[PDB]
Design a protein around this ligand. Structure first.
Ligand SMILES: Cc1cc2nc3c(=O)[nH]c(=O)nc-3n(C[C@H](O)[C@H](O)[C@H](O)COP(=O)(O)OP(=O)(O)OC[C@H]3O[C@@H](n4cnc5c(N)ncnc54)[C@H](O)[C@@H]3O)c2cc1C
Length: 295
């Protein structure tokens, strides 16, 4: 009942791009695109929290074909239109530095994807992944800690939980727990899906809390730029108290190295009560309540 590997690299599914919209607004840093693909004509099914592969055209520096890159699925199982025939991605263009062989380098698969046109064919493998799945328990608490494109699986949980079209589509799942997104981005215009997050938070004030950490607009108490771990420390006592509930799941997604400041904060909260966080967290992993995907 979790689909995995319905399509593999040796024989991928050829989808078509339907749309490709920018998510970063003017004044923001970088390019992050929301890309939607047509799934009709194949049998790709998937659920929230999974990833798929894209195989980009071309050869590397050695004249070897390009490998697949993985992307968290950014839509619910139904697609953004709730019709069960599309899938979406949230793709940032990776680019870096002049001291990297002289001048600025562009990522292969993410440049390809963030400049791809509607009507183009794309090779898609997957779905893969069973570590970031959402429990079918309507009464769960769900803590989400996202940075940048790590909003993507979170968007599939929240959309499942709170979009009226989704609730109409999923009678078994009517969500009534509490969920809290701490979202880290560099500027207000880099808040991916801002308008839709904030609409959810005003239809459902008792069920959803939305905390930002915006590093170029906010300072932490030491005087640094505000980072998601700064906010997690700000609330580490509340977050630890929520985690003690047998129903609470915690999801962590974003770039590598973001985990260690989340543990430092929760260790100091757990310790007040003679709990050793890293022992507690091992048991949470074992029990399926601790979900991490950084990259
Ligand atoms: C499970 C998983 C989920 C992912 N989900 C998403 C998602 O939702 N959205 C998204 O945009 N991406 C996601 N990615 C990351 C994505 O797969 C690709 O790694 C990323 O898009 C870059 O691929 P590329 O082809 O653009 O870059 P490549 O062309 O392969 O460039 C990457 C390589 O260049 C180097 N490099 C990268 N950054 C730097 C730097 N700052 N300084 C120096 N060298 C550097 C490294 O050698 C790296 O291997 C995910 C990855 C994984 C593993």
């Amino acid at each position: 009942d979790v689909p995995v590997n319905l399509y593999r690299p040796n024989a991928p599914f050829i989808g078509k791009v339907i749309s490709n919209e920018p998510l970063v607004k003017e004044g923001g840093i970088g390019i992050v695109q929301h890309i939607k693909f047509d799934l009709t004509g194949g049998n790709l099914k998937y659920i929230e929290g999974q990833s798929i592969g894209i195989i980009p055209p071309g050869v590397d520096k050695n004249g070897k074909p390009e490998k697949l890159r993985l992307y968290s699925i950014a839509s619910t199982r139904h697609g953004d239109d709730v019709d069960d025939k599309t899938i979406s991605l949230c793709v940032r263009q990776l680019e870096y530095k002049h001291p990297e062989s002289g001048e600025t380098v562009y990522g292969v698969c993410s440049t390809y994807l963030t400049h791809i046109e509607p009507g183009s064919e794309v090779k898609i493998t997957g779905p893969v992944g069973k570590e970031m799945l959402l429990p079918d328990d309507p009464e769960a608490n769900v803590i989400m800690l996202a940075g940048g494109t790590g909003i993507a699986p979170m968007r599939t949980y929240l959309w499942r939980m709170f979009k009226d079209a989704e609730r109409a589509a999923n009678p078994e799942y009517q969500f009534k727990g509490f969920s809290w997104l701490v979202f880290g981005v560099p500027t207000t215009p880099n808040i991916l899906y801002k308008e839709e997050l904030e609409e959810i938070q005003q239809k459902y004030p008792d069920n959803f809390r939305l905390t930002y950490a915006i590093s170029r607009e906010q300072k932490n108490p030491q005087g640094g730029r505000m980072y998601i771990q700064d906010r997690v420390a700000e609330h580490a006592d509340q977050l630890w108290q929520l985690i003690k509930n047998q129903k609470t799941h915690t999801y962590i997604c974003g770039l590598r190295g973001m985990e260690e400041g989340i543990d430092a904060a929760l260790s100091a909260a757990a310790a007040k009560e003679g709990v050793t966080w890293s022992d507690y967290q091992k048991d949470l992993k074992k029990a399926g309540r601790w979900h991490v995907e950084t990259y």
